[PDB]
């Protein structure tokens, strides 16, 4: 089951699953359903990224994207060495759902290309949400003509989604792997509680995470080869760094690019070699973790029991457990 603030997430539970092939299949089957007492889909398509001959074609494609829109009880999973070009949204009042061995990759739609992304609404805001064992790729390549979007977020959230878990996801060769909060005006965002755990974060750009406003737990998780920022806390946002393993990574720790700063309390942390450090362009006011000193006390009991894996052995355990094809393992 999920640990920490997703903690008693069942999704659909012991529910029968429904076989889908492909995007359509798996629209219609949340479409037909009820919206509440449980769906399990069995997501069994196999895409050829191979398929993909020019990386650079996707932004400029419109976006395929699942929707769970005010439904609940829901558990996308992934069969063993299933694939998708296509992202996933859970949008509205839609509460205990788990996302699961999803292999998604490439995506089409540039700005629209999110992979997974959970957003609340003047309808409500999801809760209760398992983001766990997804493997998410794209490409680093700045595409002629994308601006800054040849593809979109990794594993996102915003307007107030809260009490969610987010863990063992492999996210690789991805500009922004997760948004937390849209926006310095995302004050709904203060309501957002997530745990962070057992990802591997590697060759990536920046946001891992940028968390805007709300609490975060983020610990046991793997960074290798970020080449922006790492962990970007901001708007008041206060987020517990625990026993990760950091290397090869540029501003592993920092507060930037926002009107207000963020906070951090660190412990356990494994730094590695090739840490690196920069300035932000621009006159907002920064901050930068060089000495791994805390800024500021977790304000609060988490309210879950969790099991630390002893830091420098998180890059080893996660290696082995994170992402998609993995059965699972923990």
Same mark, same amino acid.
Request: hydrophobic share 35%; net charge neutral; charged share 15%.
């Given at each position: 089951?999920?640990?920490?603030?997703?903690?008693?997430?069942?999704?659909?539970?012991?529910?029968?699953?429904?076989?889908?092939?492909?995007?359509?299949?798996?629209?219609?089957?949340?479409?037909?359903?009820?919206?509440?007492?449980?769906?399990?889909?069995?997501?069994?398509?196999?895409?050829?990224?191979?398929?993909?001959?020019?990386?650079?074609?996707?932004?400029?494609?419109?976006?395929?994207?699942?929707?769970?829109?005010?439904?609940?009880?829901?558990?996308?999973?992934?069969?063993?060495?299933?694939?998708?070009?296509?992202?996933?949204?859970?949008?509205?009042?839609?509460?205990?759902?788990?996302?699961?061995?999803?292999?998604?990759?490439?995506?089409?739609?540039?700005?629209?290309?999110?992979?997974?992304?959970?957003?609340?609404?003047?309808?409500?805001?999801?809760?209760?949400?398992?983001?766990?064992?997804?493997?998410?790729?794209?490409?680093?390549?700045?595409?002629?003509?994308?601006?800054?979007?040849?593809?979109?977020?990794?594993?996102?959230?915003?307007?107030?989604?809260?009490?969610?878990?987010?863990?063992?996801?492999?996210?690789?060769?991805?500009?922004?792997?997760?948004?937390?909060?849209?926006?310095?005006?995302?004050?709904?965002?203060?309501?957002?509680?997530?745990?962070?755990?057992?990802?591997?974060?590697?060759?990536?750009?920046?946001?891992?995470?940028?968390?805007?406003?709300?609490? #975060?737990?983020? %610990?046991? /998780?793997?960074? @290798?080869?970020?080449? &922006?920022?790492?962990?970007?806390?901001?708007? $008041?946002? +206060?987020?517990?760094?625990?026993?990760?393993?950091?290397?090869?990574?540029?501003?592993?720790?920092?507060?930037?690019?926002?009107?207000?700063?963020?906070?951090?309390?660190?412990?356990?942390?494994?730094?590695?070699?090739?840490?690196?450090?920069?300035?932000?362009?621009? #006159?907002?006011? %920064?901050? /930068?973790?060089? @000495?791994?000193?805390? &800024?500021?006390?977790?304000?609060?009991?988490? $309210?879950? +029991?969790?099991?630390?894996?002893?830091?420098?052995?998180?890059?080893?355990?996660?290696?082995?457990?994170?992402?998609?094809?993995?059965?699972?393992?923990?």
């Amino acid at each position: 089951g999920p640990v920490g603030y997703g903690a008693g997430t069942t999704g659909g539970g012991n529910k029968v699953p429904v076989n889908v092939a492909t995007f359509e299949a798996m629209q219609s089957a949340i479409d037909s359903y009820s919206g509440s007492g449980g769906l399990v889909l069995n997501y069994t398509g196999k895409f050829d990224f191979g398929t993909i001959k020019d990386v650079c074609a996707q932004w400029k494609l419109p976006a395929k994207t699942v929707q769970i829109k005010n439904k609940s009880d829901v558990t996308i999973k992934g069969a063993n060495g299933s694939a998708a070009n296509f992202g996933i949204r859970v949008v509205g009042n839609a509460h205990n759902v788990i996302i699961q061995n999803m292999t998604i990759g490439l995506l089409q739609g540039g700005e629209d290309a999110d992979s997974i992304s959970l957003e609340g609404n003047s309808s409500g805001e999801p809760s209760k949400i398992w983001v766990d064992h997804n493997t998410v790729f794209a490409s680093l390549t700045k595409c002629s003509g994308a601006g800054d979007a040849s593809f979109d977020g990794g594993i996102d959230m915003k307007k107030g989604v809260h009490h969610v878990t987010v863990s063992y996801n492999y996210v690789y060769n991805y500009q922004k792997v997760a948004l937390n909060g849209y926006s310095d005006s995302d004050t709904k965002n203060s309501a957002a509680r997530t745990t962070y755990h057992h990802n591997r974060f590697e060759n990536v750009e920046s946001r891992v995470p940028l968390q805007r406003f709300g609490l #975060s737990h983020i %610990y046991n /998780n793997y960074f @290798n080869n970020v080449t &922006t920022s790492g962990i970007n806390v901001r708007m $008041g946002g +206060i987020a517990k760094i625990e026993s990760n393993y950091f290397e090869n990574i540029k501003n592993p720790v920092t507060s930037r690019d926002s009107s207000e700063i963020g906070y951090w309390d660190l412990i356990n942390n494994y730094v590695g070699s090739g840490i690196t450090w920069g300035t932000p362009d621009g #006159s907002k006011p %920064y901050a /930068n973790a060089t @000495n791994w000193i805390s &800024t500021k006390v977790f304000p609060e009991s988490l $309210g879950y +029991i969790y099991t630390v894996t002893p830091a420098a052995q998180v890059k080893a355990k996660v290696i082995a457990t994170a992402g998609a094809g993995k059965n699972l393992a923990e």
